[PDB]
Amino acid sequence: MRIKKKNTRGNARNFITRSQAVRKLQVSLADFRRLCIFKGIYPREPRNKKKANKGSTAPTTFYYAKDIQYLMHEPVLAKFREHKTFARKLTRALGRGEVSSAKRLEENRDSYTLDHIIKERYPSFPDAIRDIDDALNMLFLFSNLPSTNQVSSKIINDAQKICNQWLAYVAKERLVRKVFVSIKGVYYQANIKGEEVRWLVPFKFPENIPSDVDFRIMLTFLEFYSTLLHFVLYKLYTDSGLIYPPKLDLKKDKIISGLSSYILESRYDSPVASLFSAFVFYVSREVPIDILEFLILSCGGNVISEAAMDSKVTHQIVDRPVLKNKVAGRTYIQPQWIFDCINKGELVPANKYLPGEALPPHLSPWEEKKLKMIMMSNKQKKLYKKMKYSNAKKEEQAENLKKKKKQIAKQ
Amino acid sequence: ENYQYDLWGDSTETNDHVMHLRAPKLPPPTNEESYNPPEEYLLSPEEKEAWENTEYSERERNFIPQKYSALRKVPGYGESIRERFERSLDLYLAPRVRKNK
Amino acid sequence: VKWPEYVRVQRQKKILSIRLKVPPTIAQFQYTLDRNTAAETFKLFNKYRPETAAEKKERLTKEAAAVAEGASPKPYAVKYGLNHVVALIENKKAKLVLIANDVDPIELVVFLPALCKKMGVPYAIVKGKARLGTLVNQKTSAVAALTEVRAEDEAALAKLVSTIDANFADKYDEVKKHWGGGIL
Amino acid sequence: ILSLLRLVETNTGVFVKLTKNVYPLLKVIAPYVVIGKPSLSSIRSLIQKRGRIIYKGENEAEPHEIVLNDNNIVEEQLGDHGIICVEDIIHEIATMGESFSVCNFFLQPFKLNREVSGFGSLNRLRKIKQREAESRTRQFSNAATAPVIEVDIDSLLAKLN
Amino acid sequence: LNSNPEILLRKRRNADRTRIERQELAKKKREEQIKKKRSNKNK
């Protein structure tokens, strides 16, 4: 052989720069990143960064060559091109002054579907449920958003619809194990086909949208997770449960627009799913309902709200320092009791949960050696000193918790 | 009828066959920062401003731990869109490496 | 700076359009109808868009779907071919003939303003063959005419004639004289 | 009338009770406003999605209008009238009570987003479609015996949320 | 040495730099929009 050129072989055809990926695809950076979001493609780290370049030490991100080289032939890229053609051919109609032909161009418009993009991403159903962890976190955030000029109302209404479908199913087949109310929101854990998904729901207050965040990146994630959730929910309902999609009662959606609405027709294993059976809870006005009625209906209780007005009831959930009525028939609880009954599973006594007293701390469900240092190498001294510092920074923080507990317990 | 058909069916095939599929790592489970915490977690007044002095993204908590007597007294957490947006950016822009811990 | 061949050619043609002395049958163009009267001509002309190929197809399938299973007046539209416009002038059926100032061979439309002044047809040289194209489902039109009209638009058309006579033909009586393009 | 209802700004809502005194004033502003009796979900979703409170900032600044994030803010400003939380505000708004005149001037006005919300390719055509839908779904009577046009607010706020 | 195989996201660089940059850019486009409103009222 002739002397081969140096920096064109091993790591140079294994990886490519962002610029080289964009150029090779002949696609805009935005659309390159849109496809990258849909396909689940990410930058990868080579063992040599400069052999992955053509010699240069430079701030560079490396994609996998065969990954981009596999993205090139794909229906979604072709449909992006078709959207670009449609865009100019519409503004041709609009810019001239003809409205009827433009309106007709809307009628003769097909759009890209993210159907086949999931088959190649999550080939098995249990793999899709391993992703639904991050998928349900976007979607439940986007339900609790005011619609802006960035994000249309149709987007939020469809996202909220999927959210309500998810909440309805989990409360239907009784698949909750753990709850955790934090400052951030309310965490749930759910054995969905026996693999324990986790997801977060914010509190139902108006959310201050920063102008800092980019509502074009988040919209494509929503666009992928949305379709992914449609296919997941069809699979779940048509396997073990119900018809999809279920209908919604109009005068129920006028009252709550939550979870007691949206009725679903068809044609246990865990202690949590057997709890609250033959119990009827009267949720008061003061507590948030949609974060709580999900849990009651999931375990096996029943809900009658103060809100619905605007019997069999055995417990009332009230958050006031002064409670007015006080009947002999009901038992009076601050919601912390429910948030502990789900976590333990053993029905915690309501003696520490009376209205007017302070709640329990609410835990999450989640010499010679200095002389024998010497005979270690530098590649072992560096590592051992690092492990010593990592244990020290833990133990001193544990000492901080103990010292703070002692300083508070005195007061 | 949109998206109203099963696509998986009897699907046994895993995508983690080529060693190049770096699974996106489910975010760390939340450890002791609830609306009602044990108040030793509630931060000292000096570190409340020292935490605000540190630059973002090189910071242990994305939040100040806070104590609330009532569940009604829990505020709407303002920096929630920021957290999901930053996670979304972490998925497609942050380089994924196979490590041995 | 260094420009392409064609860019240099069209810039050279632009400065050549100015700096030469030009014959008065040309430069009778570019002495054209002003912004208000042009907008007001189109506020009438936009009410008579020739029925677009899609609209005609759907309506004539509506005729078939109705009439085969289980009276109309003649509809009025703008008239838009040069063979047809110079047919309509000399018929004499034209009440307002609109002429584009920018035509690919200039020699095409040079007789037309003076033939309109001959026949007594109230013409207006309006700016843009693209702008005429828009009102007529075509890319370009060179000419647009308005023969007959609905009676609601009749008085407005007659006033559009009188406004164009006063604004265009009276201000530009000097344009039959005077060789254009003596700009230093 | 639009100062009293504090509706100087476009794309802005407010709650009022309609009586025999309110109805004559409604005929004056009818070409400027679109009215209707909302449902329980329209009210409840509107307050939990949008809500302003004009009160003091850090120490000095007064004109901050922020957000209905909390319920302890509701306590500090209302409290003794019997109102403790945001859901209790929803109660006195949906059901006509004593504290309605108290909380109605507490959520001053709402900030509804405009329809379509753009000037461009898709947005101009969508604004054209909706603009011709306006004159069909709303008429200006102009006569002294103008019948007051009531529309579906459940459908309209499905568009504006 | 009994090591567990797992995946790791590296910290996305220039996160704070761009964060503050977008914070500034948003405010700048707001102010420019206000200046446009006033200058259009002079027409």
Give A291-346 as a 3 state SS string. Answer: CCHHHHHHHCCEEEECHHHCCCCCEEECCCCCCCCCCCCCEEECHHHHHHHHHHCC
Residue A182, helix vs strand vs coil: strand
Axis-axis angle for helices A29-39, A75-96 (nearest 10): 140
- Among A115, A217, A188, A201, residue whose Cα is nearest residue A159: A201
Task: Answer whether the bond into residue A245 is a cis peptide, omega within 30°.
Answer: yes
**Which residue of chain C comes nearest to A101, CA vs CA?**
C54
- Rounded to whole angstroms, how far apart are CA atoms A297 and E16? 44
Q: Are the C-beta atoms of residues C47 and C153 closer than 8 Å to each other?
A: yes
Integer CA distances (angstroms), E5 to A97, A275, B4, D92, in order: 63, 39, 38, 58
Q: Note whether A212 contacts E19, CB cutoff 8 Å.
A: yes
| Beta-carbon pairs below 8 A across chains B and E | 50
| A101 vs C: CB within 8 A | yes
Residue spans of alpha helices (H) in C46-168: 53-67, 82-88, 112-119, 129-134, 151-164
Task: Answer whether the bond into residue C127 is a cis peptide, omega within 30°.
Answer: no
**Which residue of chain A comes nearest to C135, CA vs CA?**
A97
Report phi then psi at A347, rounded to 5. Answer: 55, 80
- Rounded to whole angstroms, how far apart are CA atoms D102 and D110? 16
Provide the experimental method for this PDB entry. cryo-EM
Integer CA distances (angstroms), A243 to A103, A125, A235, A247, in order: 35, 19, 11, 9
| Opening angle at CA C54, ends C50 and C59, nearest 5 | 85
Q: Note whether E30 contacts A211, CB cutoff 8 Å.
A: yes
Q: Which residues of C touch A100 (CB under 8 A)?
A: 52, 54-55
Q: Which residues of E touch B94 (CB under 8 A)?
A: 9-12
Sign (positive or negative) of CA dihedral B41, A210, B55, B45: negative
Q: Note whether A211 contacts E13, CB cutoff 8 Å.
A: no
User: What DSSP character marks residue A280?
Assistant: E
The yes-or-no reply on E/C contact (3 CB pairs or more, < 8 Å) is no
> From 3.90.1170.50, 3.90.1150.10, 3.30.420.130, 3.30.1330.30, which CATH number describes the C4-184 domain?
3.30.1330.30
- Residue among A183, A202, A400 minimizing CB distance to B35: A183
The yes-or-no reply on D/C contact (3 CB pairs or more, < 8 Å) is no
| D84 vs B: CB within 8 A | yes
Q: Note whether A230 contacts B3, CB cutoff 8 Å.
A: yes
Residue spans of alpha helices (H) in A97-186: 100-107, 116-119, 125-143, 153-172
The two tokens of residue B22 are 């770096």
Q: Of B14, B33, B36, B63, which to mutate for an interface test with A (greatest number of A Cβ within 10 Å)?
A: B36
Residues 6+ apart with CB under 8 A from A71: A25, A35, A39, A41, A77
Contact partners for chain A, using 3 or more CB pairs closer than 8 A, are B, C, D, E
Query: What stretch of H or E contains A190?
Result: strand A186-190
Q: Note whether E19 contacts A59, CB cutoff 8 Å.
A: no
Contact partners for chain D, using 3 or more CB pairs closer than 8 A, are A, B
Identify the bridge partners of residue B98 per DSSP, sorted by sequence position. E7
* Chain D: closest CA distance from residue B80 (Å): 12
**Which residue of chain A comes nearest to D86, CA vs CA?**
A286
Tell me, in Å, the resolution of the deposited structure: 4.3
- Concatenate the DSSP letters of all residues of C169-183 into one string: ITTTSSSSSS-B---
The two tokens of residue A230 are 């449609």
- Concatenate the DSSP letters of all residues of E1-43 into one string: --PPEEEEEPP-TTHHHHHHHHHHHHHHHHHHHHHHHHHHHT-
Q: Note whether A97 contacts C135, CB cutoff 8 Å.
A: yes
- Rounded to whole angstroms, how far apart are CA atoms A38 and A223? 9
| A97 vs C: CB within 8 A | yes
Fill in the amino acid letter for A213. Answer: V
